[PDB]
Amino acid sequence: AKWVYKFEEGNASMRNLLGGKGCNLAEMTILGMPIPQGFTVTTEACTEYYNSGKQITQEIQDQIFEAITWLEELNGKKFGDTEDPLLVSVRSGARASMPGMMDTILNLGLNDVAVEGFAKKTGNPRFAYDSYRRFIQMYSDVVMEVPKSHFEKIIDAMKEEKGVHFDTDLTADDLKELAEKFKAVYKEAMNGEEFPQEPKDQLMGAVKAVFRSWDNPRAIVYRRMNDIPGDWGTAVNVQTMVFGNKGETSGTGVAFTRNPSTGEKGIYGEYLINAQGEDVVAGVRTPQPITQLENDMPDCYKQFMDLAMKLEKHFRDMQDMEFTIEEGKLYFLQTRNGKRTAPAALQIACDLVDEGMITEEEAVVRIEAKSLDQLLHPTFNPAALKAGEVIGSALPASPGAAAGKVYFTADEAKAAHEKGERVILVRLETSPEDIEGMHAAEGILTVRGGMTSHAAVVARGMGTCCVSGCGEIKINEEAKTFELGGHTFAEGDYISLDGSTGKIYKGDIETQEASVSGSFERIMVWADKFRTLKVRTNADTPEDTLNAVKLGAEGIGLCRTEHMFFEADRIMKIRKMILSDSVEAREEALNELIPFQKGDFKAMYKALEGRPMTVRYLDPPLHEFVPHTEEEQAELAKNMGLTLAEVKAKVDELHEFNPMMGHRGCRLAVTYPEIAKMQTRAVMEAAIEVKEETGIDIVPEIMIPLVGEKKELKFVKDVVVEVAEQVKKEKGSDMQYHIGTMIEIPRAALTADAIAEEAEFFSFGTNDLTQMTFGFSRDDAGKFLDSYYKAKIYESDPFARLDQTGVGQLVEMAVKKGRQTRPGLKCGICGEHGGDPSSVEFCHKVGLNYVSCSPFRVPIARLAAAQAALNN
Amino acid sequence: AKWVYKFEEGNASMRNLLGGKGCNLAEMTILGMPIPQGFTVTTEACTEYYNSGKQITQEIQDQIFEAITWLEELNGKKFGDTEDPLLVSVRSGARASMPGMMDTILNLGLNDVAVEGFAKKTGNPRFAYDSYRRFIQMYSDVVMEVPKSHFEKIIDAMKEEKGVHFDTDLTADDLKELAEKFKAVYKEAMNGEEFPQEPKDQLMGAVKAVFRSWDNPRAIVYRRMNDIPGDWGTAVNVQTMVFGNKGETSGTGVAFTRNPSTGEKGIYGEYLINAQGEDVVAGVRTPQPITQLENDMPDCYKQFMDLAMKLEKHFRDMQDMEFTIEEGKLYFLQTRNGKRTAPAALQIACDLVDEGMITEEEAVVRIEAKSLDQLLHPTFNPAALKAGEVIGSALPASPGAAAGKVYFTADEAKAAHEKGERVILVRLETSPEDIEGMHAAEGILTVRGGMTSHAAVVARGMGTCCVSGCGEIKINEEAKTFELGGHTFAEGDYISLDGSTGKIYKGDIETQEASVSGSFERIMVWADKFRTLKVRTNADTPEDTLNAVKLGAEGIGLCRTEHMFFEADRIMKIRKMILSDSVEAREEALNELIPFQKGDFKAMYKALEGRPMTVRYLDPPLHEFVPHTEEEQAELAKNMGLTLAEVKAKVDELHEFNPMMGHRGCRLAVTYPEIAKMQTRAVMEAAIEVKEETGIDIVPEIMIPLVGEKKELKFVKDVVVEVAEQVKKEKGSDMQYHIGTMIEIPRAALTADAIAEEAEFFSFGTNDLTQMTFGFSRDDAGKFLDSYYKAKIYESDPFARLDQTGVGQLVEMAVKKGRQTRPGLKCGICGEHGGDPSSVEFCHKVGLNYVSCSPFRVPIARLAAAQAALNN
Ligand SMILES: [N+]
Ligand SMILES: [N+]
């Protein structure tokens, strides 16, 4: 086929084939920007590599070399030529942008002979050898996997040995020396093989390494964390080199057209004079803030700021750009819509609509919904913060209030978090390998690196606090301790970070619940204008109901009732009913619960003010309510006038092999209708009274759990209806109410047209539906789920993301068949999936009426629903 | 002239003549609404009364009686007739709405003979006598000033005597009795005069009482508090009566089409069955929430909700309505745009724009700017609130976190606040007489009264916390104590109120700084779109600068520098310079201050990020920096090797008769240029360095205080320029800077064209300009300002509201003449007036470029500036 495209042959629309970096390089070429020429090996070439038993096919290599020849002709130089070489950069990039995770190798082409021709042609040996030891290092890292450590230790040995204080203070003589030590490393690691001297072998080795890396364990995991399918592959961009390490009038930088942490309009970012990209990211030399370049090189700044505004206007969004200045001449290497925190996304989308650059629909569609969870992260209690002990400060790389126990390796931090600890990862700097520990941390603190350092950008991405470049810190990896200010810290010691101010605190500073911007309220107003799904919340108390309404919830899709039986002042009533031996004594025990539960329901209807609430009837088996402690069993035997033995025999009788599928929910209402009769009286008495007290109308929604058969639901509904009508008569009420069901048993969805004959609404309990569709319990699934992710068997966690392919089939069928028998059938979802964007999009598309999520996920659901409406 | 108009003869545009209540009665008549017919005696009639030595002229009375005759013909009944009387309500209302402050007398016309004809015609004696004792009471209160106390004590004696528990449980027999006791009261107070029996005398007495009341001390003060001019007068509305006290199918209510505390859309308010308005406001019978009327009288509710939506749609804003149901027939008595809290105003204006009912310009224009100070009131620290001891709860009448020492009379609460205490007024209920104590309170707590009670509505108006109708409270006026829950409270004891939840706490619950809505950020976006003035802030520290920017400030209009000399680590430098005897030793002492001050300025430029800052040079006389304590004087003598006597002699030498007009500001820079030279070096060194460190450009603004003459400013500017240019040369800087002046001496404004020859900008220091224009010091003016307000000599405090008539003349002239010599002259204001709406409007109109206010007043200035732009 055709596996390679020149930049001139592509555009932004070819993203899936060229990857985002390649399509953006193409697009800037199309605009006539000062972009060094190059080409792209497509994402399809990556699939082909994978379909050929992980090998580059003859045809592909032929086409790579062909394009290389095309590059040579344009430049007038032969690739890696012994005399006047042409050198290239090789950079990977998939359809989806993955900041901090891809690969870059500069100066490819250099070798023992080309480096001398390079030195002669540039007239600058120090620059030639600096470029060579860089390339030897980047290639050893990227292609093989020799740790910078091996190289950084040597470069530091030499500088320290030579008294010099900076990489820049090395002579062309030291650099030739350094390169040889560097090559020794690669060989001292390649089982005796020498660093490839043929330019063509270097190119293929780098290309193969890019395809190979797509399947590294860290890429696999990062892709699951960001919902990126693996089949997308990655492309490889190859470009002619421009050098920011040629001298004092050369440099390299990374900047954003607006701030990615706050969203404020205006250039943000950093650069270094006489450097290559690597240097800026590392922060050994303190990177200078982008705005300062105006002082050093006014003309190049002017040009850069003009092109930067031109790029934001062309792409119609904040841009993350990389540039290189080679001896006074400005080049752009990359541009992409910049990753950003949620506050920054709202601010920015809002400013772009106000400047007339985009429409409200465009603003809504572009914000990453999952990221709005950041808006509800607790912020520090101001009093506590002022009272707090500042021990140091640095760059506010990524916003947020982080407080946790310190760990010094991504693996320890993750292991600690898993045991339930809030963790803070402290490192010299982070790397793609630290990703899982980073994701586990409340915050991230580093010794070197600025706003565009690895920790900074990956953290903004995750919406995680990060203070970076705190040079005052002294880490003792080995001992697992670090010193800052007044004292040494030890693994586990609490410290706090303010990602907004850069301040670092001793101890665990108190945090409180956050509030909300106006760009947030503004974005929600536009969202509402477009969404058609309604958004309800999963709430069991007045307090959560209020929080949820405050975030936009229009009512409740799931009000669990177990706590109304489990609570200290409730538990003995139900225990007494369970240990009874008469339907009469069961009812009498149950009846004592009425006043309590009626009371909990009046409080909820009082906080609802007319908003609907779906009340789920008793869900768990009886064993969950009986004491499992010989001691509590003894106490109960004593309160009921029974022997410890009797109580124990009843407990043993209720025991089940698989509690997930035993005698519970609807099946329990069938054997003991008394339970449902009681919850009905509590519900209807509470509603009727609150309606009498306020005049605010109520239409109770009573939902029966774990139904699989029409006549099973009918049996329970009859019981409920009989009590509801009786309560209505006793109170002189004409209140209306609906009786519906959960669709959480596969059979219910398969026979939903029959179920709809009795059910007035459907709530999709997808947590349970997923367990029964996949055949596994969430609580026992961690002993293999992780092996499944690692082996790519699953690319997403089915409990956090609706499985559209399988489980989705049952949700779609249930709505379709339910509506064959009851056209106006109302359908909601209340499993954890209702707060997940892709799931919410699936529900909008299959016709649900509303989704229901935890209070603090309401904003996410509201935005995701608007997006589903616009994207469909 | 023509002093009386029928409702049919008026409309909303005639507001200034008919008053807001009369024009709204007219407008609803025009709409064909079920409004009882009546007429309005104009505001002009009130001015006429005042121009005739406080007396109703023959012509006016003639016209009142004429209209009364017109009323009779329509009704078929003669006013106060012995047989079938026509009775009327008399209600006052000025061009401006003043909720809780005006007068209402129902049932006027009743007398010893008319009440029997009334009883016979209605066939309902209990209703006739209930109406009579009501009228006797309302007339005694309103016309004369007999305290309800006298009447409430008797009504309670009788009910208590007769065992009955409610006003409603009185027999027609008890009521005839009650009325006679009531008449006895009025006589037992009118030096033996009997309650007027002639209907016409009652009408004139009520009309005169309304005109008379316009000048009561409480109306005068309330008008100053709400910026209402007195010359506006008040109109009197006279209307045929409809009765909500006729029986069980009669009632009366007050409702708002949207909630006035939160702004949420939907009916809000209360009513009572078998009652007159008075009853609802008092809360002896617990008022029922408006929504409940749907349960009692569905058809009348339907009609009411339809007319209510029709009124909001006609007026295009949330309406505060009053209605009466007479034996099943709905009447509307009043409608007005409802008063509301700031959050409610933003929410509502925002919803109205989204529903397409109003434009963004209309939203902006209608919100009361001064009320946005409410948005920045501290809210409770959530942790502290949960930790708090709830001792009771009631209606959340007006939002806010109030915490203070309790007082039981409006006068004590005010006196206590004046001594600097945070106060909480606890009363059975409030009255117009409590207004000044209410205004002094952090919060208001009452025993009876609902959402439309006096405290509720006046408090919403003031934006003050209020929890009302807490019946569990027991007040012991005499002892100045009250019991609630766990204990008795005593005058001064701290309690806290949550006006949002209605909860009441023991102690002083901790509060923290508030945040901001999205309807607030939304309203500001629309505001910015319209305003042309810029808004800067008065800020001296990094912290206040940040708060201010966060609220929208575009820079700093006044950065005072006194603290840079006054601070513990600064004071000894300046004291040493003052006690010196050589220009050389003065400079050397001054120089030691440079590092400190340069440091304070770098911190400010660091927080400014390029935003301009106007730096005011040293303002106070030297006496302010020398010790005034023989003890500190001794310590200084010791540190300087001087005798206590010498130090004391220098202190005595610096003493002045009038420090406000002595040797200070510019005159001090003239005698000691060393001081200005030093502040210039601190300023320019700090700016240049921060510009080198960030690349972010800075244009320092140096403002010389208390200038009266062109050559005086030139002398100082030369000094400053010489040092600025020197610092520029030493640092290799080409930074630009402007030297301006305060316009705070009348002479500076009178000769501003000359001053503009040297000043690059003008900042209007209106605090001082007002003192020198009025000739009084703010700090000594309280011993007569209050007598001036009481005597109406001044209607506004000149220190809080720019005096447009006089002081405004100098500000206008200064800008006009300054621009004759320097057309692009930049002009700002930074006196306290820059945060006051009417002042901000005056500044927009006279051409200023920006206003500058304290950080927390920034929102007020931003909105007021948009409003000035639209209204002009
Ligand atoms: N379930
Ligand atoms: N002043």
Swiss-Prot record, chains A, B:
Belongs to the PEP-utilizing enzyme family. This is Pyruvate, phosphate dikinase. Its cofactor is Mg(2+). Mg(2+) binds at residues 744, 768. Catalyzes the reversible phosphorylation of pyruvate and phosphate. In E.histolytica and C.symbiosus, PPDK functions in the direction of ATP synthesis. Its EC number is 2.7.9.1. The N-terminal domain contains the ATP/Pi binding site, the central domain the pyrophosphate/phosphate carrier histidine, and the C-terminal domain the pyruvate binding site. Changing residue 830 to A: Lack of phosphotransfer activity. It comes from Clostridium symbiosum. Residues 339-398 are annotated as: Linker 1.
